[PDB]
Amino acid sequence: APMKLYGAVMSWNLTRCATALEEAGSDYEIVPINFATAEHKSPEHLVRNPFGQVPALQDGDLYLFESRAICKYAARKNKPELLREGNLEEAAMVDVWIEVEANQYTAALNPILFQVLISPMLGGTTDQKVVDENLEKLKKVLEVYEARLTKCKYLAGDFLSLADLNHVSVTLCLFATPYASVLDAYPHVKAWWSGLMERPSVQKVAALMKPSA
Amino acid sequence: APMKLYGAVMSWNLTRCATALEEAGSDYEIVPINFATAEHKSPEHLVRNPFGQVPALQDGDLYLFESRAICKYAARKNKPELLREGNLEEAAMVDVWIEVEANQYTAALNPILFQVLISPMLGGTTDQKVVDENLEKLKKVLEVYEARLTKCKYLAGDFLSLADLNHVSVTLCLFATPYASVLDAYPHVKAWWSGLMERPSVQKVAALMKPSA
Ligand SMILES: CCNc1nc(NC(C)C)nc(SC[C@H](NC(=O)CC[C@H](N)C(=O)O)C(=O)NCC(=O)O)n1
Numbered sequence: 001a002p003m004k005l006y007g008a009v010m011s012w013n014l015t016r017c018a019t020a021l022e023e024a025g026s027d028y029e030i031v032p033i034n035f036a037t038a039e040h041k042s043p044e045h046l047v048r049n050p051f052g053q054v055p056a057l058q059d060g061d062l063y064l065f066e067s068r069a070i071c072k073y074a075a076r077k078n079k080p081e082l083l084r085e086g087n088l089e090e091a092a093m094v095d096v097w098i099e100v101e102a103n104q105y106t107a108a109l110n111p112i113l114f115q116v117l118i119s120p121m122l123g124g125t126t127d128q129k130v131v132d133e134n135l136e137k138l139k140k141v142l143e144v145y146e147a148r149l150t151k152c153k154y155l156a157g158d159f160l161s162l163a164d165l166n167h168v169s170v171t172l173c174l175f176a177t178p179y180a181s182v183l184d185a186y187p188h189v190k191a192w193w194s195g196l197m198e199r200p201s202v203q204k205v206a207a208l209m210k211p212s213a
Numbered sequence: 214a215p216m217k218l219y220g221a222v223m224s225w226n227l228t229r230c231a232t233a234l235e236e237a238g239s240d241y242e243i244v245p246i247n248f249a250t251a252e253h254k255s256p257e258h259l260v261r262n263p264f265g266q267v268p269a270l271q272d273g274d275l276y277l278f279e280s281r282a283i284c285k286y287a288a289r290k291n292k293p294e295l296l297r298e299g300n301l302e303e304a305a306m307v308d309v310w311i312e313v314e315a316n317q318y319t320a321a322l323n324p325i326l327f328q329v330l331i332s333p334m335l336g337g338t339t340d341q342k343v344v345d346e347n348l349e350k351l352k353k354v355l356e357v358y359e360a361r362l363t364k365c366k367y368l369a370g371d372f373l374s375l376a377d378l379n380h381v382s383v384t385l386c387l388f389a390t391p392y393a394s395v396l397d398a399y400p401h402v403k404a405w406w407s408g409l410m411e412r413p414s415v416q417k418v419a420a421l422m423k424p425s426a
């Protein structure tokens with residue numbers, strides 16, 4: 001009996017777990033959730049995430065939330081080589097660039113991507129000040145990324161981590177704007193990305209969320 | 214032998230490394246970085262963290278950064294009970310609530326903490342509407358916490374774990390500001406903090422912060 005990825009396939013949080021599991025090879029069924037009815041906020045979803053969010057990933061009697069916790073369990077079933085926790089120096093850095101995403105990448109991206117995508121489709125318009133400010137930010141943050149792989153071939157060094165995979169969900173949405181010309185004038189990160197895109201679980205993902213939202 | 218933790222102790226990121234370090238019994242020295250002279254952007258420090266912030270650990274010729282990455286190292290070096298790896302249900306409980314603090318506890322404490330401590334250092338002032346408006350987000354996350362620590366001794370189990378220790382830092386800073394009464398309305402969160410104040414290692418950081426009494 002496979003795993004249920006709860007919540008909508010639009011969200012890069014959720015198209016984060018599924019990049020984990022599809023790369024994992026896990027067994028995952030996505031079960032969509034109704035925000036319209038508030039079913040993310042029932043007793044029925046107040047076992048799967050007691051704040052009231054998605055993703056979850058139910059597994060037997062397992063209720064795991066948060067995106068990046070969830071995306072880990074993918075790793076330690078499926079290819080634990082994604083984690084690399086045979087090595088307290090290699091697990092070290094895989095957790096450096098796991099975190100560098102949540103706090104330096106996404107954190108600059110998110111601001112561009114709910115201004116050119118969440119806000120407009122909600123009736124507000126693109127606030128271009130706040131587009132510009134985080135573009136800059138995401139520039140800076142893109143410098144480091146270039147260096148890191150101007151040297152190492154990847155992010156936690158020279159193997160496929162959970163770190164890299166964690167990057168694509170939200171990055172695909174840049175390519176859903178014309179704002180992913182940033183990715184190109186840094187040459188080592190661009191070509192890095194393509195790599196992931198080439199990989200054929202970005203592709204299930206990169207068509208998972210393409211169709212509908 | 215010895216581990217190097219860079220960054221001022223006024224940072225509460227930095228005091229969250231340097232408390233995972235204490236429980237784990239590691240061997241760390243805190244070398245100060247200093248914001249005023251911009252020691253953090255020194256072409257020096259950009260080798261311990263290319264972004265330009267504290268913390269970074271130095272261990273060996275290995276540098277880490279990102280608080281949460283480096284409280285992984287401490288648990289994954291000198292005390293592997295703290296993560297419970299090799300037990301996917303318990304090791305997965307832990308990662309979860311490591312996101313929980315990151316996204317639900319601190320993500321509301323942050324701007325409380327900034328409003329009432331940092332902000333007065335620059336401009337004179339605290340935005341009491343910010344303070345009030347993340348206060349109630351924090352009252353909201355508490356209630357889960359109350360739910361979960363009636364099910365459980367500690368956060369991820371009845372084991373102690375990274376999980377509760379990653380909280381200790383900001384909760385302390387929370388007793389700096391006048392809103393540290395909010396944990397009275399929730400008795401089981403009160404136990405568990407005060408419980409976890411008894412630890413040698415929480416007090417070692419209690420008086421790294423305040424001078425002492
Ligand atoms: C462009 C697409 N962006 C978009 N569209 C919509 N549309 C809607 C149907 C909401 N849904 C989503 S995020 C849902 C959200 N999750 C979270 O932010 C959870 C993220 C958390 N840090 C972790 O990874 O668990 C949550 O529960 N919302 C909190 C709540 O409503 O209480 N994204």
Ligand SMILES: CCNc1nc(NC(C)C)nc(SC[C@H](NC(=O)CC[C@H](N)C(=O)O)C(=O)NCC(=O)O)n1
Nearest residue numbers: 103223224225226253265266267268278279280281331
């Ligand atoms: C007594 C005041 N304590 C105080 N005052 C200020 N701001 C003002 C006081 C000036 N800074 C903070 S710590 C959070 C942040 N570090 C980063 O977030 C680090 C990024 C990463 N997530 C991490 O955990 O290391 C930063 O301070 N680092 C600064 C940096 O970016 O270099 N606290």
